[PDB]
Amino acid sequence: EIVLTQSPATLSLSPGERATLSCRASQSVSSYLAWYQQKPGQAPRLLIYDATNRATGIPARFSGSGSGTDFTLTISSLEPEDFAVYYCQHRSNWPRMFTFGQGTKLEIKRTVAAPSVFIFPPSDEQLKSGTASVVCLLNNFYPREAKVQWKVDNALQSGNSQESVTEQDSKDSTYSLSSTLTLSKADYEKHKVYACEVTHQGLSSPVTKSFNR
Amino acid sequence: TMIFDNAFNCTFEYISDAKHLREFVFKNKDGFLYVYKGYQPIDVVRDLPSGFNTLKPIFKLPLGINITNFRAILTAF
Amino acid sequence: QVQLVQSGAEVKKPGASVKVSCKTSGYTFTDHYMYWVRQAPGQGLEWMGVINPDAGSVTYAQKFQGRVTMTSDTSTSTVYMELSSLRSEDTAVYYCARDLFFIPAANSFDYWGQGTLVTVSSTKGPSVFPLAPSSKSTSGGTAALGCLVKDYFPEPVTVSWNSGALTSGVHTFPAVLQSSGLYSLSSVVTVPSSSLGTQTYICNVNHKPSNTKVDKKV
Amino acid sequence: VADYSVLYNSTFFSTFKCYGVSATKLNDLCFSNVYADSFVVKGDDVRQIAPGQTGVIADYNYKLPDDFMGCVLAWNTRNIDATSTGNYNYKYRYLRHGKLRPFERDISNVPFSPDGKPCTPPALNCYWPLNDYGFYTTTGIGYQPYRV
Amino acid sequence: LRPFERDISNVPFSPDGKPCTPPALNCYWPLNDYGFYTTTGIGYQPYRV
């Protein structure tokens, strides 16, 4: 089947500029391409069908183009309620096939903020039941790039750490990250100095916060 | 050199250690490799000489392998 | 107005069959192609799943050929999907969308449904474990708290602070699938250091399937 | 159980132009469900019914998709559905907001108007959205009733 | 196959020749996992023969 490849896969722009979304196929397919607009949390919505006709309800700011193998989506004016992921669907001819792409995120461009570094030591209530976990707070950061690494006696740690990132806020246009280091009950008392390494682009030096038990 | 190429999935290891006309006939039936052997002192170098040369079975290793080819004769002749 | 109403959540064992419907209304449901999609968490959806409601012709994908079987009902105007051999990577939200063209032709999707969250795992319960408000990490004039919940897979819940009183710092961290097979919810709040001790900060759990509400003070 | 044999033997077809696949593959490949159509064009409207052609009939009367797979069957009816006194029995729509979709039905008799405020048939800027063809028998080869 | 034979292989499957890649349209994997569980009926159970 014809696969769809998206090289950019991301587009960080400000409300008011023009979008440069792309959707490239593998072979020399026809113009039977259709984009979509799926708001995170809501249901997807059709944007442009057949790559040459405007759908119903879509404003005049959306206008797609492309022919054969060079497709692009050019938005006239970006709107604050139009920042979502856009998927393009490619259809075959004979065996009623339909193929989809990967999607391109459209985040609102904002100035690089300093990620607030905070660490929470585990409470005595969780130590009685085992599975001690340390949480490191990383909020108020624009770029989705943060390497959260623990310092197990001036060493590294991986595999037992899972990170969760929230969506872009609508008030301050910031993100939130929370990492959890899954450990054991008998293993927490083996070490005393626990630190959280924060690697951010806007920070000139990696901020390291530790606590003494 | 073809033996030491790769040993990904190996099984059924069986090493039996201890002019000229040595005839061999291979038969694969129901997953059984029948091997026969026979010897006859000849002197002509043209082709297979006349005779009967009753063959004797030597090995009957099944191996459960559907054999379809045979190659890799000796070299340095 | 054309609208497609689906069912709610449905948890199924790893090996049983799932039956999810797709009720359509607002138009003449006689000549219209019905499709089915399911966006996996982090991944995407790629398969046709087109079924003819009027006739008895069905079409499946290549990866899902004998595992999914669909049917239609011209009387109730509602299609049914039957996906057997549920794997651990198919637990996502299933959607059913119509087509822009009629049965002889084919086009993109125009009218979407609402979603059907399908999960294939075991069930469990949450546990409210408050964090520790360390006074050493209070640089910046403010402080921080937390209501980190333990591992629990079914999460049709929402968090707040003081029954929705405080609306400053309500960023809820999404859950992640740990190695055990459950989800863990995180929720912090940024409050000034001057309000430490005076103002109360107690999260509220509204887990309906478990019928348990534990309110623990940090 | 189709045959596809009563169409290749006779040669009374006006324009036997297939689309999508060839006429030879229609006898071997299986079909899940077939759909037939029936309409009468005004002679010179056969060329407009094609995956890519436009005009006055393939825009708001009978839309054909660009990826259609079938065959066009047209034949003259100058003696079966023709009348010397008048054949005012077939009409067509020529006023509608926006083009239609492939395989659509727009059976209606409401008046036509650019903006809203539904007007009456007797008006100054509002007229009937349909008009009779007017098939005759003493005209040229262009104005002839063809059944497609 | 034939009686008492083995067909250990992992090449892709295709009706005609022209050895294809696992990502294709008419070429699929010739093997499939069983999927044994413990909360099923008496039919879908692992039996060692």
Name beta bridge partners: C116.
Answer: C94
The 3-state DSSP class for residue A116 equals strand
Query: In this structure, what token pair is assigned to residue D13?
Result: 């077809």
What is chain E's length? Answer: 49
By C-alpha distance, which of A98, D42, D36 is closest to C33? Answer: A98
Nearest 10 degrees: CA dihedral of C117, C119, C123, C128?
-50
Q: Which amino acid, residue A64? A: G
Question: What is the residue whose two structure tokens read 């959607």?
Answer: C95
* 3-class DSSP assignment, residue A125: helix
Beta strands D130-132 and D18-19: pairing type?
A: unpaired
Ordered alpha helix ranges (H), A15-161: 124-129
C-alpha C5/C-alpha C49 separation (Å) is 18
For testing the chain C interface, which of A48, A86, A137 should be mutated: the one with the most C CBs within 10 Å? Answer: A137
Task: Kindly determine whether residue D101 and residue C52, on different chains, have CB atoms separated by under 8 Å.
Answer: no
* Tokens 């819940």, located at residue: C157
Q: If you search the block for the tokens 């019905």, which residue do you land on?
A: C34
Among candidates C52, C55, C101 on the partner chain, residue whose Cβ is nearest the Cβ of D102: C101
Number of H helices, E strands in chain E: 0, 0
CA nearest neighbour of A175 among D107, C145, C174:
C174
List CB contacts (< 8 A) between E40 and chain C. Answer: 15
CA dist C165 → A172, C142, C205 (Å): 20, 19, 15
Strand duo C142-146 + C186-192: pairing: antiparallel
> Cβ–Cβ of C15/E37 closer than 8 Å?
yes
The C-alpha atoms of residue D56 and residue D92 are separated, in whole angstroms, by 10
Q: Assess D19–C contact: CB distance below 8 Å, yes or no.
A: no
Question: Residue with structure tokens 């624009």?
Answer: A142
**Closest listed residue to residue A6, CA positions, set D57, A16, D50, A20:** A20
Neighbours of D56 (CB within 10 A): 13
Q: Looking at residue D61, what DSSP letter applies?
A: T
Q: Mind telling me how many Å the CA of C14 is from chain E's nearest CA?
A: 8
- Which residues lie below 8 Å from residue D86, measured CB to CB, with a gap of 6+? D134, D136
DSSP-derived secondary structure for A80-112: TT--SBB-EEEE-SSS--EEE---BEEEEP---
Is E28–C13 a contact, with Cβ atoms under 8 angstroms apart? Answer: no
- With touching defined as 3+ CB pairs under 8 A, do chains C and E touch? yes
CA D42 to CA D142: how far, in whole Å?
8
Whether residue C14 lies within 8 A of chain E, CB to CB, comes out as yes
Chain D meets chain E (3+ C-beta pairs below 8 A) = no
Instruction: Catalogue the long-range contacts made by A20-26 (C-beta closer than 8 Å, 24 or more residues apart).
Output: A20/A72, A20/A74, A21/A72, A21/A73, A21/A86, A21/A104, A21/A106, A22/A71, A22/A72, A22/A73, A22/A104, A23/A66, A23/A71, A23/A72, A23/A73, A23/A88, A23/A101, A24/A69, A24/A70, A24/A71, A25/A69, A25/A71, A25/A90, A26/A2
Distance CA(D112)–CA(D127), nearest Å, equals 6
Q: Which three-class secondary structure state does DSSP give residue A20?
A: coil
Tokens of B31: 């997953």
| Residue C194 φ/ψ, nearest 5 degrees | -70, -20
Distance CA A149, CA C23 (A): 49
Angstrom distance (rounded) from CA C162 to CA C191: 13
**Deposited resolution, Å:** 2.9
- The residue to which tokens 């539904």 are assigned: D118
Of residues C73, C91, C70, C69, the one with CA closest to residue C12: C91
Chain mean position to CA B62 = 14
